[PDB]
Design a protein around this ligand. Structure first.
Ligand SMILES: [Cl-]
Lengths: 9, 276, 100
């Protein structure tokens, strides 16, 4: 199951 | 005995041809188990292995929401990276991300990963400590300062040490028929005359799983690394992999050459020779 | 902009036996950027309805794809893979050889 944390460069 | 779960993500911009295409796939070891493609007619995360099919609708809904959201953040990221590199809006660019975890035989975390590449080049990676970053360049240092300020590494560590390892344990059990079965290579040696003076000996490994394997040739017991043609391990399309290694052998020398095969499905390494 | 030219292997799923149905594979790997065109050819002509895997990549970030189709090898029929990529000035044709 995937990581659910939005992370923007 | 040891295992891994990895998610791969690629966005590729295409100016004048709509929004960037996003493709993500998940693997346990060398087995693909989920996919999502933003160019699908109705994009949804889809199963690709039998043992994930039993997950219920809530899983597929959550996974699909995560993939859609990541497609959108990647499009924002592609716009940001044009600024950071002073690039025009005319060209196609690529953003890649991989993350996941490796565990040992007892299911404990061995190490975690979360890393990005831009235009095929390392951009920023979470270090093995799951607490600090390696930035490739001064652009990636701008991201590093943002992610330090927001305590991103702490969020990733929590996932990689927790959920990632727990999902992998679940998948290994549900998929124990296949994920916990090694298929050994079927091996043989072929002989291919080149001229009156020499012939190729080719050592084959077919039908094996997982993909990791070692195939070498020795002559009089000495490794022939510099003189061996070793093809990349390649998928057969039935879950298994193939590989071969070839040496050019002077006429009459064939019995001096031995092929050596190592694979986790073999209780002991094999030695083979050409059998005319 | 970095570019990495594809490695290309064309081969069958099982050892070729004339008259027995099999799968013809073209595996392209180690390439960047990800845009690539791959045809499978029978007697020089494009095979229709070839399928392919979803884009993925290796530890070094380079891309790989598998293209494949069912086929029944014979003594006489020639098969090949044709690849185009930005690193190639003309398409590369690699012939299927049952011994590789
Ligand atoms: Cl979408």
């Amino acid at each position: 199951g995937r990581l659910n944390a939005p992370i923007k460069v | 005995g040891s295992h891994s779960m990895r998610y791969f993500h690629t966005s590729v911009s295409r100016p004048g041809r709509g929004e960037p295409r996003f493709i993500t796939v998940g693997y346990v070891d060398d087995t693909l188990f989920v996919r999502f493609d933003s160019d699908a007619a109705s994009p949804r995360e889809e199963p690709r292995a039998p043992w994930i099919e039993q997950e219920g609708p809530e899983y597929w809904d959550r996974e699909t929401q995560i993939c859609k959201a990541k497609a959108q953040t990647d499009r924002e990221d592609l716009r940001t990276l044009l600024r950071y590199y002073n690039q025009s809006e005319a060209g196609s660019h690529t953003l890649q991300n991989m993350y996941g975890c490796d565990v040992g035989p007892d299911g404990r975390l061995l190490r975690g990963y979360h890393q990005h590449a831009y235009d095929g080049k390392d951009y920023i990676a979470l270090n093995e400590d799951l607490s600090s970053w390696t930035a490739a360049d001064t652009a990636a240092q701008i991201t590093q300062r943002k992610w330090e300020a927001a305590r991103v590494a702490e969020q990733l560590r929590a996932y990689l040490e927790g959920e990632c390892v727990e999902w992998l344990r679940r998948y290994l059990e549900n998929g124990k028929e296949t994920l916990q079965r090694a298929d050994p290579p079927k091996t043989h040696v072929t002989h291919h005359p080149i001229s009156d003076h020499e012939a190729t000996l080719r050592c084959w490994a077919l039908g094996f799983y997982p993909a990791e394997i070692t195939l070498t040739w020795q002559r009089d017991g000495e490794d022939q690394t510099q003189d061996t043609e070793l093809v990349e391990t390649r998928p057969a399309g039935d879950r298994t992999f193939q590989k071969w290694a070839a040496v050019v052998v002077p006429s009459g020398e064939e019995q001096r050459y031995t092929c050596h095969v190592q694979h986790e499905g073999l209780p002991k390494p094999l030695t083979l020779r050409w059998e005319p | 902009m970095i570019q990495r030219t594809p490695k290309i292997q064309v081969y069958s799923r099982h050892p070729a036996e004339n008259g027995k149905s099999n799968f013809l594979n073209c595996y392209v790997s180690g390439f960047h950027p990800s845009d690539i065109e791959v045809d499978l050819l029978k007697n020089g002509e494009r095979i229709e309805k070839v399928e392919h895997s979803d884009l993925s990549f290796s530890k070094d970030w380079s891309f790989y794809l598998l293209y494949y189709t069912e086929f029944t090898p014979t003594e006489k029929d020639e098969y090949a893979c044709r690849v185009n990529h930005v690193t190639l000035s003309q398409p590369k044709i690699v012939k299927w050889d049952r011994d590789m």
